[PDB]
Amino acid sequence: APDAASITSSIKYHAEFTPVFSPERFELPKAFFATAQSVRDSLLINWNATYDIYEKLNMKQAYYLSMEFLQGRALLNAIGNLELTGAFAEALKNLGHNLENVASQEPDAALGNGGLGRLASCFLDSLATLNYPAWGYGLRYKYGLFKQRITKDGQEEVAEDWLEIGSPWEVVRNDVSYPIKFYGKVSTGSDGKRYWIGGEDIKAVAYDVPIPGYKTRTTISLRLWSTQVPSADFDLSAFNAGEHTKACEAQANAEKICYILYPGDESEEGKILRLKQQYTLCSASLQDIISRFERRSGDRIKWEEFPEKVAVQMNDTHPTLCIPELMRILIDLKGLNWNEAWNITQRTVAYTNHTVLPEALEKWSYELMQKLLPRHVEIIEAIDEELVHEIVLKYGSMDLNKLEEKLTTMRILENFDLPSSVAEIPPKKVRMANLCVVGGHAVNGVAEIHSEIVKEEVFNDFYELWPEKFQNKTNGVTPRRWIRFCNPPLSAIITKWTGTEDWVLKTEKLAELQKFADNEDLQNEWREAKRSNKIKVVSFLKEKTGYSVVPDAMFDIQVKRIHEYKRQLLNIFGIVYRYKKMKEMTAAERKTNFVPRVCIFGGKAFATYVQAKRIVKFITDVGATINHDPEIGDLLKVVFVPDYNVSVAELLIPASDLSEHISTAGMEASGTSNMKFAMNGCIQIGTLDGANVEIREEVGEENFFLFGAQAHEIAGLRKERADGKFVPDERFEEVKEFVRSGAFGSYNYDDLIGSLEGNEGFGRADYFLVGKDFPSYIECQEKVDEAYRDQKRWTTMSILNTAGSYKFSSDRTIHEYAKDIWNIEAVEIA
Amino acid sequence: APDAASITSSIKYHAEFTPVFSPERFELPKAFFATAQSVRDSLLINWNATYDIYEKLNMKQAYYLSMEFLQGRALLNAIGNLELTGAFAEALKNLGHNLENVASQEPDAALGNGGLGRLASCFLDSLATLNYPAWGYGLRYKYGLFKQRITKDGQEEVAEDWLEIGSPWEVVRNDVSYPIKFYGKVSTGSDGKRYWIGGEDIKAVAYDVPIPGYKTRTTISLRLWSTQVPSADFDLSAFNAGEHTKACEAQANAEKICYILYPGDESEEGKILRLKQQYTLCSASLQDIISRFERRSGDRIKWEEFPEKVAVQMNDTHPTLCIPELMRILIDLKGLNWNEAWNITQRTVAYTNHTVLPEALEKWSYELMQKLLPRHVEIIEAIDEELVHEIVLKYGSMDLNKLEEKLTTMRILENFDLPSSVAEIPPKKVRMANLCVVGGHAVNGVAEIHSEIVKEEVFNDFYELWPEKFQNKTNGVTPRRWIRFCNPPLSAIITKWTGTEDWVLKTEKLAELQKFADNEDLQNEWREAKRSNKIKVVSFLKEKTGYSVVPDAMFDIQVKRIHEYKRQLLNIFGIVYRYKKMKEMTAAERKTNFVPRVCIFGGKAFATYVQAKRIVKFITDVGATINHDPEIGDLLKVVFVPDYNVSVAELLIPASDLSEHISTAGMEASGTSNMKFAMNGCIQIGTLDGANVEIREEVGEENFFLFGAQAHEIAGLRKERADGKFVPDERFEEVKEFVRSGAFGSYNYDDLIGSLEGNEGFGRADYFLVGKDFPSYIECQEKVDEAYRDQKRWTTMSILNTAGSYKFSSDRTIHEYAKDIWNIEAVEIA
Numbered sequence A, B: 001a002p003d004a005a006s007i008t009s010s011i012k013y014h015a016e017f018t019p020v021f022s023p024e025r026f027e028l029p030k031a032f033f034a035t036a037q038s039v040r041d042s043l044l045i046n047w048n049a050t051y052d053i054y055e056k057l058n059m060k061q062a063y064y065l066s067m068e069f070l071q072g073r074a075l076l077n078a079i080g081n082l083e084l085t086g087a088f089a090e091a092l093k094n095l096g097h098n099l100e101n102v103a104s105q106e107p108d109a110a111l112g113n114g115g116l117g118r119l120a121s122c123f124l125d126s127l128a129t130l131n132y133p134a135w136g137y138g139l140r141y142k143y144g145l146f147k148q149r150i151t152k153d154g155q156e157e158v159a160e161d162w163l164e165i166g167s168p169w170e171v172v173r174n175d176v177s178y179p180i181k182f183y184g185k186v187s188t189g190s191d192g193k194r195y196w197i198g199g200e201d202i203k204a205v206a207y208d209v210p211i212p213g214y215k216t217r218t219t220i221s222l223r224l225w226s227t228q229v230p231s232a233d234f235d236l237s238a239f240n241a242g243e244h245t246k247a248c249e250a251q252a253n254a255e256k257i258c259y260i261l262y263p264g265d266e267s268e269e270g271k272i273l274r275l276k277q278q279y280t281l282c283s284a285s286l287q288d289i290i291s292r293f294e295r296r297s298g299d300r301i302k303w304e305e306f307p308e309k310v311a312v313q314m315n316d317t318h319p320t321l322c323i324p325e326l327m328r329i330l331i332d333l334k335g336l337n338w339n340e341a342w343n344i345t346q347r348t349v350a351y352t353n354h355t356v357l358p359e360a361l362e363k364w365s366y367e368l369m370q371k372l373l374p375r376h377v378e379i380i381e382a383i384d385e386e387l388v389h390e391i392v393l394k395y396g397s398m399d400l401n402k403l404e405e406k407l408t409t410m411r412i413l414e415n416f417d418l419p420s421s422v423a424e425i426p427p428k429k430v431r432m433a434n435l436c437v438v439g440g441h442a443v444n445g446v447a448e449i450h451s452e453i454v455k456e457e458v459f460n461d462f463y464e465l466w467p468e469k470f471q472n473k474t475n476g477v478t479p480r481r482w483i484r485f486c487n488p489p490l491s492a493i494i495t496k497w498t499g500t501e502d503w504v505l506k507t508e509k510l511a512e513l514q515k516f517a518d519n520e521d522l523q524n525e526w527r528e529a530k531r532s533n534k535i536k537v538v539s540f541l542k543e544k545t546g547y548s549v550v551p552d553a554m555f556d557i558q559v560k561r562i563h564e565y566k567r568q569l570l571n572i573f574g575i576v577y578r579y580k581k582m583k584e585m586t587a588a589e590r591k592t593n594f595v596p597r598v599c600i601f602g603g604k605a606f607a608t609y610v611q612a613k614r615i616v617k618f619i620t621d622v623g624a625t626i627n628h629d630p631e632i633g634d635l636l637k638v639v640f641v642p643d644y645n646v647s648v649a650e651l652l653i654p655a656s657d658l659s660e661h662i663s664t665a666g667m668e669a670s671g672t673s674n675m676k677f678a679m680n681g682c683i684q685i686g687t688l689d690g691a692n693v694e695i696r697e698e699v700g701e702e703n704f705f706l707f708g709a710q711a712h713e714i715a716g717l718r719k720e721r722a723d724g725k726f727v728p729d730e731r732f733e734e735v736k737e738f739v740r741s742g743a744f745g746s747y748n749y750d751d752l753i754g755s756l757e758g759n760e761g762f763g764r765a766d767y768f769l770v771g772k773d774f775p776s777y778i779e780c781q782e783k784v785d786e787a788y789r790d791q792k793r794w795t796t797m798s799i800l801n802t803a804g805s806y807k808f809s810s811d812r813t814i815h816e817y818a819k820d821i822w823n824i825e826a827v828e829i830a
């Protein structure tokens, strides 16, 4: 275990000897690079320790596969979990730098996008920390999604450049690479097994990222696959010929798999690439797992032991191919027969949902998947047939309607025939979500109410057939990154009033703040802390949004994928209402009615999704005018933070007073931002749905602001729109007209209101009930103004959010996965 | 300065902490990787030392630009020059490995091809060793030329894979990258200077490879440029659209510059790429140099000082663009006017000619170059005009014919007009060799007789105008790589019979072997050593050529570009003659007359060059039959070594008895293989030309086997063929018929002999006088048989070759460059 003295040397060493810059000066990016290399060294000691202990013990290991990991930045949580925070700070002093400066150089790992990505990253922290043998498998996306620029003209995209110099935290494993095949033909050989020959051949090379646990040695792995083709494949004859672009083809169409995350699938080309990406992950991962299982088994190898040595968690329907791919490996390659392979598959694999609505579930073209993964469609089919037979045996051909209905609901293959049937152009499709719910031994939703839908609607029939499979694993977020490290002031207070530093682990200790929520001394330190955080954010918003703002206003934050269902538009409209009102009142009354706010927006809109980009533009103009109005001044600001990601969240969240989770009700499965917020003492306005429902229950009904129509009514209210019974509120009408008047200027918005107006239509009719929720919304916002004025009350609510957030530690989530699905036990590393 | 104890730790560290493999086992490639990382560390100490001393002193630095660097393997010369050879050996013991094993894992740096490449690498060794402030600039070719496979069907190409895992010896410098532009337009701005806007934009990122000097700290650099485009440029809109291959375009056509060396220029596309490669090097290099000059200058900066602080050596006509490119930087960017810029340019830049014949000299399409490099053709033109004016001022308008002739010979622009002229469709071309001979202050050839041609033929008229410019710098090769490290047995003997280990530096000490060339004791140790070396080669030829051979035969080596001018088939034909003869005589008589031989062939043929590939096939079949003939057995073997490169040379050369340098006379400028051979105690058969002429003079006329028509006669003898006077030797006729008979079997040869036969024609007529030299050749080969039998005589000759090779140390060459062209002095590093 080192100290500042030793680390100063560790960094000097790496700067000189593991260099990526010239020796001219020790600038900031040099300093970061060398610092991170130092940290790795430490991480690799513990990584190899964990590897050894895991090898010897050959215990059950678990495997979280995710199309996205939103790792964020590594340094601060790294030296935090290694407890060397102090030492690195002091080390850098000696070398003419400081920690925060250096931490600033590090780009977020653009390995993910949203909550499903973050949930993965949050889970890893929990697993390492809790000493559970588990790894994460993902793709190594070179250019992420995009770097968001907020130009005068709204949002614009650029390729993320986080790998320009390369990531210091990663370890390439040139001996870990697997073969991945696409297209081709299948032929049965004289052993009676299938052989999948021909098509395309690419390699998947492993890059390990060490995840360290807090106050433990357990250092697990995020193994990231990266695709290429062996240099053999470079076509010399063609290159020398003159066909350079031709000569590249194999490498071009191999690397492209790992270029970007969620590549636009309007083209067939894009759908192909998407599928490539899913399979690559499922394949290269399972092959690595299987490899490791064998190694650890030795001479004495038994495939009955595989599910007792391995569990695979499919994060959504993207990893679905794990089911047929494992089948494929167990049968075609390892030799086992259908029953053995299938039994093992189910015992191993499990599905985590993440999606509410049935049309949000991933489906594929049968013809497409057939062309790309012949062998896999074969197996899929066999499973579907297996299934029709299950569905028929249980039930039987009573009430043909019952039977027939069930068949179409549950079948994996949409628009297909039955191998035999009784009873006395449609595009052929493959339902990945069905495959998952049959292939896995466990299906779970991500919050009470989410897991309820899946049970009683989305997979209703599968609940009937296999009730045992359905459970729930309410989401969480890591206390380390989201309290201890993102918000040190908060931490000092917590540690104090609890009496140990142990809440970081034993986070049920937050509840011990309840008896002190009224204590005025505690409220003082609380406000002082929040403020402190806010003062940091001021400087941030200055450099990033070029708008100067005041600490002493309320911080009202909404940060999520920009989307009509997320309804940032409802929020900005509530902003515009307050603005219209404030103009219609003199200076003095203006200051009396509305509490000062800084309204923070952020998050990305998919480049193709026009309305969403229109929303980004809207907000940016609202802010343009409002923030440059001598008449308003500092009573209202509206900023949009460019390129929202983990770094930003780590900064805004600690300093938030109010945060908005105002999705149309019944649509959000869970959400995880809202947990980070409640943890950081923030108060939540939102609809009743997803995690919001539990957070409210835990924090306190009166310490969480609620509004809007509830999930069950929505169809009622849309029906109301469809018939023409929704009478809009006059305040709603006001806002729209006020904008039309061109208050925000030369950009015309008729399109944007366009979406909301009319009773019928694809794009018309306000599917997401902005107009309908709007009244209770703004009135709720009045109750926040009101609450904020009563700072003794406000601050109590703040403290109660934190003291209620404990259940939302991902540590609780992982224990539950680990005990109830994976049956993995903790391995302690000496 | 470390020891085995410390290095064991250094390697353990790197294997674990700078890893590129998983922690599972310490295999060979792991062991090599970690070992090399260790060595780097040492190299970087001394690299940074050299950098500091150079910075402070800001003395004249020199710069060797080469389209190719044939670095080979680094490890053995690295730990050799650092004198840590012992320590690394012992270190590896402790870790369950041995040095040679580990050295075997390292691929040769595929950064070059031929002698001009090797000469560069050899020069670097000399410069570091002799403490001269100089660097090397080259491109970082990802896939080299090709990996040569010698299949049943002859030679076949594969892309070199030396960067699959990446090179441990390189240091990326992410802060060292320059902008390179192609195409575009030029417009004059309001400052009166030219502005080269638009076209293509790519980055050139530096990779440093440390060259350590023997028994010094001076550690210089081979800075290798590597091209790419900033991740910004990745077209998201297009990728998400579906046009993946489109989205890549910029990166594809940026990286392609550094894909392969000498990419086939049959296509226009290929010519474009070739030019791109030359410019990239000239530009990115000069920008780095200029940058460094400025840095070192500080506030007090004077461009008159530039040529007194810098010299640029253009290795052949590939770096020609350095002249206009420096002009461009000095004028358009830095602001200086024509005269200042030009004077500096000439003072800085110098040309080394590596080419005999005038049509072997590099020319370009005017239209091509003035689409890609507009600004550069402008400057070129200005220089040519400057030149016409020079040519006219010296030489009055007296002899019109004289004047007009001269104009067309010396002008840079072939098939152009004169800005005004007196006197009372041809494709427009640009002559890079002329540009070089005008732009530089120094032109030099690579051997006496080569430099004589350039003076008195190729640049005859330029000799008249600027005699001072012409000198000679006879080639050399490094004693370190080519005696001390490739051949340790030889070294032990040398060190012994000389007083000291100092010959490695003070290599004139080899001459001390002359007294003692007769000494029988020395001859014993000599033969013992040679043999030892040969025993290594036996095992090598076994694994790579799959032919078992005996040490006790004579080793007859020919290894060079496979080419009709290099002959090769004269030798293989001389091989076939001996074979035909041996069959026509009984076992017993056969074993007199012919001494046992192993005839080694090797080297690559360009994939397009059909005849050359036909030659590779020929040899491989000759060997096929001969080596599988119970009747011959071990009196004759013929092998072709696949993938001849530095590693191989290092192995064959020490173990050679005879080596062949039998190019058609007057064609070889120099050659460098023949110097490494004479150094290693080998005896040379060859034609009178290139370095052969000096080697013979130095080693001793009677210790070098000579034959063939001499350089002056060739045109005589070709004229003789053209008229039909040649009259072939009956022995020549024999061989051809014997092969025709299909002795070597099912592959039909005709068309191979096809080249040699006939008196007129493109492919006919034996341009290279195989048939004509053949008689003296084979008869000379008889004199080798004869000499080899007299082992006292033979071995004396062997020893005299070594004792004569001293003048051929590249150390002598570099001193000469350094004193006579560069005016650089040695800087000692404390």
Ligand SMILES: OC[C@H]1O[C@H](O)[C@H](O)[C@@H](O)[C@@H]1O
Residues within 6 Å of the ligand: A114, A115, A116, A119, A354, A355, A446, A475, A668, A669, A670, A671, A672, A690
């Ligand atoms: O469960 C992880 C996340 O996945 C989805 O994208 C949902 O929108 C959200 O409800 C949830 O937080």
Ligand SMILES: OC[C@H]1O[C@H](O)[C@H](O)[C@@H](O)[C@@H]1O
Residues within 6 Å of the ligand: B114, B115, B116, B119, B354, B446, B475, B668, B669, B670, B671, B672, B690
């Ligand atoms: O000098 C460098 C080398 O360049 C060329 O490859 C010539 O063939 C050779 O004569 C010379 O040794």
